Design a protein around this ligand. Structure first.
Ligand SMILES: *[C@@H]1O[C@H](CO)[C@@H](O[C@@H]2O[C@H](CO)[C@@H](O)[C@H](O)[C@H]2NC(C)=O)[C@H](O)[C@H]1NC(C)=O
Ligand SMILES: *[C@@H]1O[C@H](CO)[C@@H](O)[C@H](O)[C@H]1NC(C)=O
Lengths: 42, 49
């Protein structure tokens, strides 16, 4: 029950992530960039 | 006990009176005065939020 304000690393709202596919008709998994944190949704 | 003074002429006088009504409206920003564009100082100001 608190409205506390933080100041840390977050994913910014309405940001544009990159889309990586795995379709057969490809297989790509490049060396990504790990900065202060990574959001990964599969 | 039997004397009175009664006027015989008049005059019209226009005087002025100066009255203040309102003063200036001011606003103060907590940031940019206590911690000016400093991320280390603004990280401590939240404890005084
Ligand atoms: C009251 O005083 C005024 C002046 O403040 C008088 O007016 C003058 O009257 C005379 C004639 O009586 C005129 O010639 C003048 O031009 C008037 N004006 C001035 C500025 O002197 C007035 O008469 C007085 N009333 C009385 C004594 O009953
Ligand atoms: C969207 O992606 C573009 C690149 O196409 C990027 O410059 C931008 O910061 C992203 N976000 C918004 C909200 O436009």
């Amino acid at each position: 029950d608190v409205l506390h304000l933080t100041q840390d690393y977050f994913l910014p709202f309405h940001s544009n992530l990159t889309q990586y596919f795995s379709l057969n008709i490809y297989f790509d998994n490049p060396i990504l960039k790990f900065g202060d944190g990574v959001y990964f949704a599969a | 006990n039997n004397s009175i003074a009664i006027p015989t002429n008049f005059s019209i006088s226009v005087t002025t009176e100066v009255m203040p009504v309102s003063m200036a409206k001011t606003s103060v920003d907590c940031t940019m005065y206590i911690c000016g564009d400093s991320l280390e100082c603004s990280n401590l100001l939240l404890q005084y939020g």
